[PDB]
DNA sequence: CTTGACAAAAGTGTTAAATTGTGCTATACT
DNA sequence: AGCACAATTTAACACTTTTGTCAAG
């Protein structure tokens, strides 16, 4: 569940990163960030009741 | 807590107990010297070290924090006297 | 010196606030990112609230109990106990006057009871939704003359103020 | 909050109900609701 | 002259003659109808309170904003080198940014729309400092859903300056 | 006695607690297998049974 | 909701067609050049007459009385320059009117492009600064973009504007977002660091080490420097941060006070001063006086050598020998009583 | 895999995501060098 | 109690390095 | 994003005064 939440935030990050830079050539490496899912899972494991 | 080398919390219910007994100076020490009062606890420890009876405290010092906090809310807090006159609990401090 | 047998609470006038004030905090910093000293006009500033060290000013010119109460000529730090930072209060002079949210939001709203304004309409005024009429100046709206205390939205304000026009493409 | 646009209404209310991603009704809920109301359901969505 | 906001309210409150309203509400009070009577009563109660208090109603609209001493809202590093600070510091800070931004925007000659918006943000900032969360969503530190704790929250609550730190220790 | 430079920060076992030393752990930075948070040189941990 | 309020408020004022845009820009520039020509007329500065005209435009009495309690007097320095500009022939007059109209055009242009700014600020969230703050910084950047714009270049104003709004919002993150003040340079530095770290974390499949990230940063970058910048980058912690599942505890009230003397410490200092005072009294009067002149036991300051020699009328060397002797006598009596052998920490 | 609809550009390319904690044999995880456990939650089943 | 001779410590005035603050960029973009 | 330049702070450094001490009176 939390994984898919973080995945949604990552989806939004991807969506923000498309409309700028060079829409012609972009590798998925530049399009994707670790922190949304990383911090989602981190938050769930450390914090959640 | 113990880990912090802490003192025991004296609750409101315990205050009610002391009041029910009618012990004024015990409750006074609890509320001033033995808890947060700076000059009170200092002069007290001094007195016991020198073998005196501990003096009478003045300012709990959390109450002064309460006063200045109330003033931060733009509420004028005046501590008066027997005859309706200003008594400054901050001694030459915030007087300006 | 004297006993305190009485404690009162009242509204502090702006003048009283300024009287309490040792100075205004202009700059919204806390401390320098490295030196960790209070910033010039910042919230933790010593030039108003007092020194971090007892009798020691910021620059370190006047160093002792010998000098007392004398303001240092560079930092402007008063030589005194470092405890005054708990007592001495600052202030922020506001450009446009604002309302204390207590007398607004309180269950029997006080300013609303005084001026005879409902919580709703007063909420609309204070948060700048609808203008209110202090001086009508013989103005009229929809056949009925506008009087004091009356609330108008942006449209009607602009209408009775700047006039009414129609643009046709 | 936003002006009553038609396409905004379409997209929003598609994301509210008909969206399989945004709206996922439990497989157990799918099954149970299917065997309670006396009907059947294609997907996990309230509407299609 | 139709003004929107705390300025206008302040002006009305200053214009108020409490003696006029005193006599007038006293007369309004003996009206046979019960509703009008009781309403006039509560109104006259606030009015009389202001009368024998000596306090002026316009004080409820704040010009100068009192700033709490640094040691009361401390900022200090701990073991590990990392810092720590009160929420009141951040609240005060944001109030300062908005107040200064508006301060330079007024002198700028900026249009009425921007001025109005920043002024509204200023009211909500002052209120966020006084009592946070009562009006609209509580202002929280970015990335955290934990509401910032204001002066009102310092005084009241089970953990308030009274219950936790005063009536018990 | 020369007033000297550095002061003593040493870790001393809390009151009410005491025992024998079994485990010894030293993680120093600039050494393999360990990444320590910024600003911190080394962490030293002691097991006491 | 304030956001709804402002968004609707700017929703009221419509957009501007190319005609309107060009015309407004034209009228603005005409206004400015009119101000310059008026500067050649009465011989006063541009911003002077400009701010006067504004004072006649964007409000009557409200521009003067509250940009702080003190600026330029209403009946005096405003009205006299007003009346001085009033007393000119026809051309300078029509140029006065033109200037005013220019100012108004500036205002409207600002509004439509406030809609623009709202879009841009909508792009920038996540900051460490709230939405409306972003909007307002962007709006100032907008007034800025309006001022320096040139329509003669035949470019749509939107682009030039966008750059300025963006830079203004970045000025916001630099000047605002962190509780502690971190100036622009290290902000950009930290940003580059984090960005690169993300990149090579994507490449390597794991987080880097200070060495490899420093090498990836280019020349002048080592482990200590990236560690230091990262040490600056970290934010303070809220004192009200909850501790444990308990609702009765904060983080801040677990912080001790080392600034304030403990009762044991005050008593310690007291006993030290007293015992030292009594251990001093067995000395000769002069040597004791000299010692307490050296220590700061009198005025708190430190009286050197020559000063003591000047006060007692003797040479400084004598003072030196005196204090040494005193020290050793105290060595004896203290070697006896062992009252002051403590306080050695 | 990343694609372009209009271009027909196919750049597939692998990527990273993050770090995922693994459950031990006893059934507990380890977070920041501390053994922790995730308790099962009880709510009402989906459906109507 | 004294004096003169000396270097180490603490001062005092001009400079270099790095440090911080401010402004600017133009396909269009609301 | 990032650079460039002005204004500014720090640390840099070269030569001065006194402050502490040594030795011998
Ligand atoms: Zn000073």
UniProtKB/Swiss-Prot annotation, chain C:
This is DNA-directed RNA polymerase subunit beta'. Zn(2+) 1 binds at residues 57, 59, 72, 75. DNA-dependent RNA polymerase catalyzes the transcription of DNA into RNA using the four ribonucleoside triphosphates as substrates. The RNAP catalytic core consists of 2 alpha, 1 beta, 1 beta' and 1 omega subunit. When a sigma factor is associated with the core the holoenzyme is formed, which can initiate transcription. It comes from Thermus aquaticus. Belongs to the RNA polymerase beta' chain family. Disulfide bonds: none annotated.
Swiss-Prot record, chain E:
Coiled coil: none annotated. The RNAP catalytic core consists of 2 alpha, 1 beta, 1 beta' and 1 omega subunit. When a sigma factor is associated with the core the holoenzyme is formed, which can initiate transcription. DNA-dependent RNA polymerase catalyzes the transcription of DNA into RNA using the four ribonucleoside triphosphates as substrates. Belongs to the RNA polymerase beta' chain family. This is DNA-directed RNA polymerase subunit beta'. The chain holds residues 453 to 621 of 1524 of the full protein.
UniProtKB/Swiss-Prot annotation, chain F:
DNA-dependent RNA polymerase catalyzes the transcription of DNA into RNA using the four ribonucleoside triphosphates as substrates. The chain holds residues 780 to 828 of 1119 of the full protein. It comes from the Bacteria. The lineage of its organism: Bacteria, Thermotogati, Deinococcota, Deinococci, Thermales. Coiled coil: none annotated. Belongs to the RNA polymerase beta chain family. The RNAP catalytic core consists of 2 alpha, 1 beta, 1 beta' and 1 omega subunit. When a sigma factor is associated with the core the holoenzyme is formed, which can initiate transcription. This is DNA-directed RNA polymerase subunit beta.
Curated annotation (Swiss-Prot), chain G:
Residues 279-331 are annotated as: Sigma-70 factor domain-4. Residues 188-266 are annotated as: Sigma-70 factor domain-3. Its main location: cytoplasm. GO terms for cellular component: cytoplasm. Residues 109-179 are annotated as: Sigma-70 factor domain-2. Residues 1-35 are annotated as: Sigma-70 factor domain-1. Residues 305-324 bind DNA. Keywords: Cytoplasm, DNA-binding, Sigma factor, Transcription, Transcription regulation. GO terms for biological process: DNA-templated transcription initiation. Belongs to the sigma-70 factor family. RpoD/SigA subfamily. Sigma factors are initiation factors that promote the attachment of RNA polymerase to specific initiation sites and are then released. This sigma factor is the primary sigma factor during exponential growth. This is RNA polymerase sigma factor SigA. It comes from Thermus aquaticus. The lineage of its organism: Bacteria, Thermotogati, Deinococcota, Deinococci, Thermales. The chain holds residues 94 to 438 of 438 of the full protein.
